[PDB]
Amino acid sequence: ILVPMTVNDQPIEKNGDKMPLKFKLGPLSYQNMAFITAKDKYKLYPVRIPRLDTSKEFSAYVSGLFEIYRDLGDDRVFVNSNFAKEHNATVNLAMEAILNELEVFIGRVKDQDGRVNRFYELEESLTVLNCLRTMYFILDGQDVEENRSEFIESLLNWINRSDGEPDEEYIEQVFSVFETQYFWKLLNQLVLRGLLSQAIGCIERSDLLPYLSDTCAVSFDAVSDSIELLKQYPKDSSSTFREWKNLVLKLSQAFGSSATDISGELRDYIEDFLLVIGGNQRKILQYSRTWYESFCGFLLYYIPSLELSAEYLQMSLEANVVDITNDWEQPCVDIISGKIHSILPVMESLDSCTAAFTAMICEAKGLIELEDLFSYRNGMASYMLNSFAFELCSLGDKELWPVAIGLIALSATGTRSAKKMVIAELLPHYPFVTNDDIEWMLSICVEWRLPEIAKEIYTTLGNQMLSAHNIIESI
């Protein structure tokens, strides 16, 4: 990552005569200093720590995530066939809770913002979290028939929000210049996305219904029966689905062996549509612009069970390779295909808080695969957590220091004395500024048996830092 310290006054212009540049990290995150020990270079440069979040919405998001973490209490790691759901069911409830929390964060960011790149990173993290919850946070390792209503509702969500290919700019390109092939590509792209209402609506928009009445009726009836069929699509039960796909296959067979009173290309645009709905693997893969459109189709219309996922993704990856433009595609691709180790780094490139708590709830679900605190444990979740805690300690936001101290006190790694050492070394740097806040410091000193730091902090409070004011009121 290459960032300019100042996009205004660059102190070095030429390559020759290199100047001794000096830099010092400040006790506060967003206030570090740089300078130059050279003639005619007497400017001080405040360079805030790169890629950071100082907004109040971020602090409320971290407060909410730490509440859910403390709310989740004692869960670490537990296939198996014994006892009950325990953490499993509870873990999912917690997963959809943090997903709601991340969405509220993204909403408050889109409202008050100056840079939108943070909004882009958060939405990429939300897309990966949607994929993760769809893949391992609904069925609890089982199949789709167990709980079809929830699974699809999440899948149709994860696809819909993920990309932005279905948009007003794209449709108008094809809506402005039925006969054209592109129309059917977009219709099948809508179908592969479960965007039923959009597809049906475009129908009215589409040239065909009156014209079908004008031409072969039968086909027109048929197309109307297929429009009706998509309105009556069942999401609640797999048994209802079984009849549904049976009906679509009977309709596709009946039309394939029927009268051809239309154009060859129109006959050749209706059979596809019927067979994409039927779930034939070729043309789900044909009219797919990306791989997740393919994967969404195979889950939707061929077989709705989780098992053939390994196959589906492979076939989809044989149609449209992983788009490296964004940072969520390969993660989701890896997430679907078992491997989860690779995605934790990429999400840490997006947001450290989201990535840390993601690794936390993943360990909580299990999903796995010399005695420092900053050292790897089972799944390096303590790393993600304790490092995010250490990162927060420098942020200078006193509303988040309780989060950091709590997150360290809740680490499964490290002795009681290891956390005692950490608190003893970290607590003096706490930005106490109000007279009622020091009760928190003294209570923690009592809680972790550090009375020496308690009295050493009251000495600094002594005389308000040696009579550093006049009135020196409570506020």
Epitope: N280, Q281, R282, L285, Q286, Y287, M315, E318, A319
Partner: nanobody, 125 residues
């Protein structure tokens, strides 16, 4: 009695373009071997392009990859071969090849004996 008619051939200059078209009967589901082959004068017939899956993928030969483009109309017995950046190495008689129905069956009676009648594609130097 089904047929395989093809058109679009002709005589063009090096670096020019041509568009080959072909039609057929049955074209029933997948398991296809349907595609363009070519035969140079005196040489043996080599495969140019072929639609393996129904839009899932394509099989090109290594002398036309990046220049030729094959497309098929969905679930239909037609093919188009767009020949861009034609060179004197593409001078041949091109043939449309296919399969009447699509079942694993047994390896006997490949379609019908009449394939494509041929269209002459020659690119000068």
């Amino acid at each position: 009695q089904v047929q395989l008619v093809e058109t679009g051939g002709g005589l063009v200059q090096p670096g020019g373009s041509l568009r080959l078209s072909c039609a057929a009967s049955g074209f029933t589901l997948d398991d296809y071997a349907i595609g363009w082959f070519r035969q140079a004068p005196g040489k043996e017939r080599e495969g140019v392009s072929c639609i393996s899956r129904s839009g899932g993928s394509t099989t090109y030969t290594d002398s036309v990859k990046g220049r030729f483009t094959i497309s098929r109309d969905n679930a239909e017995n037609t093919v188009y071969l767009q020949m861009n950046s034609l060179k004197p190495e593409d001078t041949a008689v091109y043939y449309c090849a296919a399969a009447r129905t699509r079942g694993t069956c047994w390896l006997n009676r490949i379609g019908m004996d009449y394939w494509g009648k041929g269209t002459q594609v020659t690119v000068s130097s």
